[PDB]
């Protein structure tokens, strides 16, 4: 190997408050949790690509400090019962993660898709907006 200590990004990007939470190769140990909501005020943009982008830059800085240079990025949408779709921020978050010096590796999607479980919230006629 080329002396690269692989990290794991484990991005969680809902419709609100994207998450970038770098963890070791074991996944059990946590590094540089800072999320989208920490980097913006208005709370309108908890999931914004800009909130995700500052959060990702900060996690990359902390990865530099601890020493993790290669990261395994994991995209995890809300999944399960709630809309199974990627958020609007995790993409800018991974772009920032790639940009900030870090050498990417093995992007994968681990969003949990159920096999017909748990009739979801909203009633039958659903959110009637």
């Amino acid at each position: 190997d080329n002396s690269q200590v692989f990290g794991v990004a484990r991005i969680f990007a809902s419709f609100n408050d994207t998450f970038v939470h770098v963890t070791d190769l074991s996944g059990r140990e946590t590094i540089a949790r800072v999320t989208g909501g920490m980097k913006v005020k208005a709370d309108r943009d908890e999931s914004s690509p800009y909130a995700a982008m500052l959060a990702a830059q900060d996690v990359a800085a902390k990865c530099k400090e601890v020493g993790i240079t290669a990261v395994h990025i994991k995209i995890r949408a809300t999944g399960g019962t709630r809309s199974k779709t990627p958020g609007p921020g995790g993409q800018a978050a991974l772009r920032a993660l790639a940009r900030s010096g870090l050498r990417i590796g093995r992007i994968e999607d681990v969003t949990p898709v159920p096999s017909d479980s748990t009739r979801k919230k909203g009633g039958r006629r659903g959110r009637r907006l």
């Binding site: 809309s83 006629r125 659903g126």
Partner: protein
């Protein structure tokens, strides 16, 4: 009167169909009147492929293709613009909409 021959279901001889929830408004609609999409797109946008490519080990990475099926209520399908209200004799045509990319 009959706006459509098929009632818009595409059920026509099946007794009853299980309901599947709308992906946006969580409406419960039968799996047939559950207007469908196969959103095959990249896990990373086509905008930022270059930055991910240059900063990547394993030269020429596969860059996986995320897959998911989208289920809309028809109300969302009108509002979220997956479908558009069409003129009368244009309701006949059922083929894919003229091959978006070719």
């Amino acid at each position: 009167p009959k706006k459509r021959a098929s009632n818009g279901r595409n059920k026509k001889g099946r007794g009853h169909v299980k309901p599947v929830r709308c992906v946006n408004c969580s409406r419960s609609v039968p799996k047939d009147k559950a207007i469908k999409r196969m959103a095959i797109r990249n896990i990373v946008e086509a905008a930022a492929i270059r930055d991910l490519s240059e900063a990547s080990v394993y030269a020429e990475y596969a860059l996986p293709k995320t897959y998911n099926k989208l289920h809309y209520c028809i109300s969302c399908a009108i509002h979220a613009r997956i479908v558009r209200v069409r003129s009368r004799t244009d309701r006949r045509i059922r083929a894919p909409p003229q091959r978006p990319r070719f």
